[PDB]
A = this chain, B = another copy of it.
C-alpha cells in the first residue's frame, strides 16, 4: 500500500458506510482488512453473508429450468422437497450455515394448503418458500477476566 493509514482512522469510517481499508501488519503483511457492505442494516451487512445467499440460488434457478411444465401434483411436491434439503445437508456439514438439530438450521415446505391454495393452482403457479440462517464473521472479539 502507498500509505500508512492508522489504527483509529479505521474507526470513524466503520459506521454508516464501509471504507474497508487495506492495512499492513507485522508478520503477515499487506493484508486486506474489514468485510462490510454499504448499508448498516442487521439483515444485510458482512459481504460473505451476501455472497452466500447470492450463490445458493443461482444453482437452484439453473437446475429447475428442466422441471417447468411438469404436472403440479403430489409426486412432484415430495420430490423437490426431498431434493433441496439433500443439498443443504451437504452444506451444513461443511460449516457454511450454523446450527444444531439441522431442522433448526433451515426449513423447506411445499404443499396444497400451507401454500398455493386451489385457485392459484388453477392459474398454474407453483410457489415455494425456504429459509435458512447463515454464518456471520466474528468481527469483534471481547474477552472478560474475573476471579472465581
| Interface residue ranges, A against B (CB under 8 Å) | 16-17, 26-28, 39-40, 86, 90, 117-119
Alpha-carbon gap, A40 to B27, bound state (A): 9
- Chain B: minimal CB distance from A87 (Å): 8
A29: nearest chain-B partner, CB-CB? B17
Name, among A26, A27, A28, A39, the residue most crowded by chain B CB atoms within 10 Å (CB to CB).
Answer: A27
**Contacts A17-B27, A86-B118 supplied; 6 other A-B pairs, CB < 8 Å:** A16-B26, A16-B27, A27-B40, A28-B39, A86-B119, A90-B117
Task: For A27, list chain B residues within 8 Å (CB).
Answer: 16-17, 40
- 8 of the cross-chain contacts (CB-CB < 8 Å) are A16-B26, A16-B27, A17-B27, A27-B40, A28-B39, A86-B118, A86-B119, A90-B117
Task: For A119, list chain B residues within 8 Å (CB).
Answer: 86
- Chain B: minimal CB distance from A136 (Å): 21
Task: For A118, list chain B residues within 8 Å (CB).
Answer: 86
- Chain B: minimal CB distance from A117 (Å): 7
Task: For A28, list chain B residues within 8 Å (CB).
Answer: 39
